[PDB]
């Protein structure tokens, strides 16, 4: 911060690429709800036993735990104890979301949302 740089050289001012999210024309439905853990931006959320917004994870206990169903795509980041507004409707991008491991291909990501208002489709 203190000193200047006297020598000759180059550098990047920066680089930028847009982030597109919507893939279609379904209506957009949102509700806030109390979070339960750390939540990124556009990470798929679930609901735990207590009713908090745990970010989504399959392979959860025996019995399929209620974390296994996935409900909403988060919209703005928050912490455990900060309630989160999330999308409950619409048609969203396939790649701009925040997934996790073992859920890689196109087919499994739509098999997450085979039923709801939320639909997951590719861009072009």
């Amino acid at each position: 911060t203190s000193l200047p740089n006297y020598l000759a050289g180059n550098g990047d001012l920066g680089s930028w690429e847009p982030t597109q999210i919507f893939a279609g024309e379904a209506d957009i439905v949102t509700e806030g709800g109390a979070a339960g853990a750390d939540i990124e931006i556009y990470q798929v959320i679930a609901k735990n036993a207590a009713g908090a917004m745990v970010p989504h994870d399959p392979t959860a206990t025996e019995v399929p735990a209620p974390q296994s169903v996935a409900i909403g795509i988060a919209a703005q980041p928050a912490k455990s104890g900060q309630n989160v507004p999330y999308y409950i409707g619409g048609v969203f991008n396939h790649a701009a979301l925040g997934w996790h491991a073992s859920l890689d291909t196109l087919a499994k990501r739509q098999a997450v949302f085979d039923r709801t208002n939320i639909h997951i489709g590719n861009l072009y």
Binding site: L13, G14, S15, W16
Partner: protein
């Protein structure tokens, strides 16, 4: 945003400290002498003697 967050600048907040004159108020007389030193002469004449 994009490459960098845009801004508007508002005015600079300049706190300026001073140290005003309180003990110089009893030192009013100025001497600008080119010699070396300043000499004084104090004389006490005690008179109150029986």
């Amino acid at each position: 945003a994009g490459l960098y967050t845009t801004y508007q600048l508002l005015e600079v907040q300049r706190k300026l400290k001073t140290l005003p004159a309180f003990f110089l108020q009893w030192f009013p007389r100025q001497i600008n002498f080119q010699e070396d030193m300043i000499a004084f002469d104090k004389v006490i004449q005690d008179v109150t003697r029986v």
